[PDB]
Amino acid sequence: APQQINDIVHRTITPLIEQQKIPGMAVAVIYQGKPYYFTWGYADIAKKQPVTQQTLFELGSVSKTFTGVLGGDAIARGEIKLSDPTTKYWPELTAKQWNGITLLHLATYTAGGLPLQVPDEVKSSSDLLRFYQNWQPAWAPGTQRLYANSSIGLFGALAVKPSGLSFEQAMQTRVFQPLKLNHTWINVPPAEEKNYAWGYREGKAVHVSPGALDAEAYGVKSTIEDMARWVQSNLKPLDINEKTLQQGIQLAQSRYWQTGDMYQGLGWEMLDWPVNPDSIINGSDNKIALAARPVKAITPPTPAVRASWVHKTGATGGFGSYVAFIPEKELGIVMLANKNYPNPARVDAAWQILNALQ
Ligand SMILES: C[C@@H](C(=O)O)N(c1ccccc1)S(C)(=O)=O
Numbered sequence: 001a002p003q004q005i006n007d008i009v010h011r012t013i014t015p016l017i018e019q020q021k022i023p024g025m026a027v028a029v030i031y032q033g034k035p036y037y038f039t040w041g042y043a044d045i046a047k048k049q050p051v052t053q054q055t056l057f058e059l060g061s062v063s064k065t066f067t068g069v070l071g072g073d074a075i076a077r078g079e080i081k082l083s084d085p086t087t088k089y090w091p092e093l094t095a096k097q098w099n100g101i102t103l104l105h106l107a108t109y110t111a112g113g114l115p116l117q118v119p120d121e122v123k124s125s126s127d128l129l130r131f132y133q134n135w136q137p138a139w140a141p142g143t144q145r146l147y148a149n150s151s152i153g154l155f156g157a158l159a160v161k162p163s164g165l166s167f168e169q170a171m172q173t174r175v176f177q178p179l180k181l182n183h184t185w186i187n188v189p190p191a192e193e194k195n196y197a198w199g200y201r202e203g204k205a206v207h208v209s210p211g212a213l214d215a216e217a218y219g220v221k222s223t224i225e226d227m228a229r230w231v232q233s234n235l236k237p238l239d240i241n242e243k244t245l246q247q248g249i250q251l252a253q254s255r256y257w258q259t260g261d262m263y264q265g266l267g268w269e270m271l272d273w274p275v276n277p278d279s280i281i282n283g284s285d286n287k288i289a290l291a292a293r294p295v296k297a298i299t300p301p302t303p304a305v306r307a308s309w310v311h312k313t314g315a316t317g318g319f320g321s322y323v324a325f326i327p328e329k330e331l332g333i334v335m336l337a338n339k340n341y342p343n344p345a346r347v348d349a350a351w352q353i354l355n356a357l358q
């Protein structure tokens with residue numbers, strides 16, 4: 001590999017792994033249309049299985065970027081509009097607080113205080129309906145952002161309804177397959193089980209537990225190679241042959257809301273490049289990232305801005321991931337680990353690497 005890339009990546013990631021006690025890690029740097037891969041440690045400690053370029057990691061909330069692009073593709077297909085009322089796609093949602101809550105609000109966490117999690121007690125479809133029917137907003141729509149699986153997860157479920165496809169079938173056929181992400185999964189198939197890393201939490205091997213809206217909010221598993229291809233697809237949407245997917249990728253990077261110095265896309269979040277590293281590093285801490293914050297509407301949304309830092313953190317109980325890229329520089333990074341270690345450590349490492357290369 002180019003020595004600059006080798007050195008920049010190793011000098012940043014080796015200490016990170018040591019400090020954070022990460023059992024296994026894979027990193028991709030995407031530099032001018034080419035990926036460079038690096039791996040460390042163990043996918044399975046007990047079985048002594050190393051992390052390889054074929055190891056599957058749980059992406060956790062990085063999955064929301066796939067959800068956002070799938071939703072973008074459904075808009076491009078003319079199947080949904082972000083301006084449509086939620087009730088158009090879920091007519092059983094008759095409670096009055098839903099008047100004025102659109103798919104845009106669901107997609108961007110601005111419905112007015114939908115909770116981070118769907119309650120664990122929600123086990124059935126009828127339970128889910130009751131939950132949303134009985135939910136009371138703290139805020140008028142389009143006024144406060146509160147990061148929420150119950151928000152974007154419902155967006156993903158509704159976005160695919162006109163197609164008649166299940167969320168998994170829509171994702172596979174409309175996103176994974178056209179982009180040749182052949183080792184990216186909502187449900188890991190038996191053929192891939194030998195590559196599926198264990199997550200580690202408090203010294204125990206764990207995989208993500210089933211939950212309502214899991215696929216839509218945090219349920220994708222992928223390899224470092226497929227994730228590098230995902231970054232390249234989001235860096236160069238016009239190279240995608242399928243018109244609706246090409247458009248959907250771009251719609252996910254449109255800037256719909258601003259809070260502080262960040263802009264909310266569909267799944268993706270964006271800041272102007274060059275960024276203040278303190279703002280992305282400190283801003284990534286859950287003390288800010290999961291907080292309720294006022295939003296300014298961007299009226300109308302800015303189309304995807306080339307000079308942006310585009311990124312997403314995400315975790316499950318046993319995994320921690322980060323993806324960031326800068327379209328104007330054709331530059332990106334993917335960091336996948338089988339421990340949920342703090343967001344700011346991820347973002348700090350990514351910025352050190354990308355800043356040294358840009
Ligand atoms: C960088 C550029 C491209 O596709 O070559 N564009 C882009 C802008 C934002 C995000 C991703 C790509 S584009 C289609 O505006 O010219």
Ligand SMILES: C[C@@H](C(=O)O)N(c1ccccc1)S(C)(=O)=O
Pocket residue numbers: 060061062149217218313314315316317340
């Ligand atoms: C906060 C969020 C994430 O970091 O991806 N979630 C999480 C919460 C606790 C532990 C691990 C992850 S999630 C996937 O539940 O939304």
Ligand SMILES: C[C@@H](C(=O)O)N(c1ccccc1)S(C)(=O)=O
Pocket residue numbers: 117118120207208209210211218315316317318
């Ligand atoms: C992330 C997930 C998991 O099992 O890994 N968990 C979860 C549990 C209930 C609802 C949503 C997510 S978690 C946060 O306990 O680790």
